[PDB]
Design an enzyme around this catalytic site. Structure first.
Site, PDB file in Angstrom:
ATOM      1  N   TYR C 135      -0.684   3.794  13.215  1.00 60.67           N
ATOM      2  CA  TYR C 135      -1.129   4.335  11.914  1.00 60.67           C
ATOM      3  C   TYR C 135      -0.125   3.848  10.872  1.00 60.67           C
ATOM      4  O   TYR C 135       1.028   4.278  10.840  1.00 60.67           O
ATOM      5  CB  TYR C 135      -1.214   5.847  11.974  1.00 60.67           C
ATOM      6  N   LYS C 163      -4.849   1.671  12.470  1.00 68.04           N
ATOM      7  CA  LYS C 163      -5.457   2.344  11.305  1.00 68.04           C
ATOM      8  C   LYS C 163      -4.632   1.817  10.129  1.00 68.04           C
ATOM      9  O   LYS C 163      -3.484   2.178   9.983  1.00 68.04           O
ATOM     10  CB  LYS C 163      -5.397   3.892  11.376  1.00 68.04           C
TER      11      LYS C 163
END
Lengths: 291, 291, 291, 290
Positions: C135, C163
């Site tokens: 992330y 992500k």
């Protein structure tokens, strides 16, 4: 107690599973007071790897540090956390242990508004009824507090001051002039001499764990106007600081402490241990500056 | 002449068409030396709106400023330009006029490599054979020079020092320590007292056009170890600086000079004239600090 | 399961004491899947106020969200935390619950080295044995991961994707072509159409809790080459996004949900509740865009 | 209309940083004839404009205009921190028949928005030509908000913007708010994303060597042939990554030298292309038929 003076930002030794080494922590606390002749400990700050800890661990550190030192030692508890409920729990805990003031980092990660930041401080104070020191460290949080925002915070009688860990000497001077009645403790060890002549009431630093005697001389000589002598000691201190920064500051400071016979352990992962490729250089530093 | 001391960054008055008002400029140069009692002028720096001028206007300013003051006055000619041919032309012209040193802003706008920046300086020096002062102002240029990069620059015997307009006192201290033989002139007026105790050899500033007498006392008092009095004067200086920055620094400084009977003209567009919304506040400032 | 598709970054409703409202949370989870027609939930992300929660609350959200939705829904568990022991505890818990993959924010606050960051991910993976999605959110963490560093992470067979919540499409394109075998889910709802044509495998977003149906059309139409209709829907979505950003995104999104009869509670302090100065504008937005 | 794909015109120099006019004409001709571009953006950043004196900028404007036919669109970047120079250059380029002017947002000093606005309004007043705002925050540190664009775009001679910034949220907001204005994208490495974001064309240094691919990207993306367009963006971004790593302006000119152009040197303090990169460059040129 009045909170002026020089403070070690307490370092914390861990094992390989990130558990606190209580015996080593006690030794570090005693080193700071008995060997480095400091006025107090700033506990569970950035320097103590506090933001990597769980709540139980933070409480453990607060208790062990308190038990390690005598009742004349000044104790500031950093309880700031993105979890306000945790900040309040810790603040109540430290207050019950008898810490002289609380401190809290400005909420970070999320883009909190100033009103949200203000009311975080106000909510901690309401729940704990202890005095509060703002911990401003814009280089890590990205949060800048303006002179006007400080005014709003300092309007609260229990916001007694600020731990200012920022490079901006214009802002520091403006704070000092606007709030002669508030406590300002500088957090940039490498700019202690400049902070001192800027009228700070003291300083909090990781490097005072190993260099607190020299730091006291800088602070004292600068205020006695023996500024060249103060600045010379800042040159020496900054050799130390530059070196430990290049090697990884918290593990390197703890290695310097291991050389004094302290059970200095490991940094908490994901921080890596001191790299032994730096060992020779570190030994030369310790020898040169009698650390 | 050594080039230590306190310098006005010379301001320039313009007419409505962005042409230099030579009579007004002579008055401003005279003000700095006779009234503000400064050691020298730093001509065609940022404060002179230099980067808004054409080449002939830059020459016009160099000439008028040199003719306005006596032979004891130290003169440093800022000739940095993104056009290296222009920098050399200006450098030769200022040298022929008898300027004591040249200075040049680090090349900006484009992302020049350090080697490119280094050889810009070396090329100006080769063509002009005058001494050179690096002008480092990272807040405007986005260029940061490391200690190692400074070493390479200061290896040149005609790179005699640096005008350091940055807020980083760790870097300033490292530079002062590493290069005890070189000239360091601080460019941040609001941190003169901290720069002084950090061992700078002088300072160059726009606000010394109006506050050069205080600035000298700060510099002198701090080096004598009278740091409390020096810092009180910094407080007063910073009230002025905060106020003039808020109003638009160059136009406001020139409005203060107009109050002394100087034909201070206008700023050069696209800078806008002093906003008269600020007039009452400026008058109060001038009265309060006897400007 | 295949992890491609569109996910709600699950919002969490709290009570006045910062405790999770489980009923409301189930309704928000159900809304994302049943009403907004999304492929999955990204649980305990930034949008869930995760970094304000204690460990038991994070577990609570993971449990409650899983229980609230059908086993054909894709579930990604964000377990990143500055406390690596906590990240591991949570990763084990989520894996035991049956989450399809874990995700972890790059460690922030401290200036960790890339090696430290890498080994944080590798340590989580080895302890949990689940697949891991990086992330990356540089605007909140200040951590930038280079193409070479991504290459080092993606060498690990259990690092299956990223992500990517960052505005830079050069870097996104470089990643996409260097790692054609990895999952890239975009995190910037306002640039969904651009991310889609840059070959992302799907997207994760807070605004999809209220605008997931438009988002699906953008994603689908752009991949079908119906780019003008897709971009028009992006214009409409960006009207919504610009508005909620201006009002305070997480509280505002939850207020939109409240209009659907969802028990949307409050944000967790120190986030303040939705400011009712924005109510009139919000109600008109809801009406105009049929939210 | 000024829609289309433009070469940000590169300039060849001699050892003394004087313009090599013979090379310059060849570079201009290459952009239009070989790369099939719609126009030239003259004296922009890519032309090393901010390193030049006023007479050199006029020399470049003249030589460029004389090198190309009358169908070729010409935009003159005349932004300068010296407003009198900008106006001088604006008048000269306008008299030469340039189709529009452009100006970088004033930089170096922390000008206020009002100061910046009136810099644009002042150049327009004195030249009466159309003006394209040149926004390049990564070099200038100047950010223009949507509300500030609205104020500029209320002027009828501020016809558009050369948008050299990575923010596609802002780009989309600008496109939606100002459907009547010209948006020309300046980030070559994000041309496909800009295209689907509704830009009217693009200006770029790399279109001097890669303008044929750039045109295919633009056209294919607008047809909805997204996958082929993106593949060509991949090829283009290999080229852009490579030239960026070697020193972009000198490297692009070394590519043009490969084609037999007298591409000269960069203007100091830019250093020449380092030969350490020569093998890698040759491989790039072979790989992409540059």
């Amino acid at each position: 107690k009045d909170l002026k003076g020089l403070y070690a930002a307490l370092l914390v030794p861990f094992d390989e599973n990130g558990q606190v080494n209580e015996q080593g922590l006690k030794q570090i606390a005693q080193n700071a007071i008995e060997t480095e002749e400091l006025d107090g400990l700033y506990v569970n700050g950035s320097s103590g790897e506090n933001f990597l800890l769980n709540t139980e661990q933070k409480k453990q550190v607060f208790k062990v540090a308190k038990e390690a030192v005598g009742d004349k030692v000044k104790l500031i508890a950093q309880v700031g956390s993105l979890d306000l409920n945790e900040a309040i729990e810790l603040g109540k805990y430290a207050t019950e242990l008898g810490y002289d003031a609380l401190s809290a980092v400005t909420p970070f990660y999320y883009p909190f508004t100033f009103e949200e930041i203000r009311d975080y401080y106000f909510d901690i104070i309401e729940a704990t009824q202890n005095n509060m020191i703002i911990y401003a460290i814009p280089d890590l949080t990205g949060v800048n507090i303006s002179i006007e925002q400080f005014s709003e915070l300092f309007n609260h009688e229990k916001i007694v001051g600020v731990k200012y860990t920022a490079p901006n000497f214009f802002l520091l001077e403006r704070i000092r002039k606007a709030f002669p009645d508030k406590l300002i403790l500088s957090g940039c060890d490498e700019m202690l001499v400049q902070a001192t002549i800027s009228g700070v009431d003291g300083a909090i630093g990781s490097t005072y764990n190993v260099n607190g005697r020299r730091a006291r001389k800088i602070f004292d000589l600068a205020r006695q106007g023996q500024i060249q002598e103060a600045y010379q000691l800042q040159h020496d201190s900054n050799d130390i600081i530059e070196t430990v920064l290049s090697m990884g500051i918290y593990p390197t400071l703890k290695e310097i402490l291991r050389h004094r016979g302290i059970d200095a352990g490991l940094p908490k992962r994901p921080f890596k241990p001191f790299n032994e490729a730096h060992r020779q250089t570190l030994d030369q530093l310790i020898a040169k500056y009698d650390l």
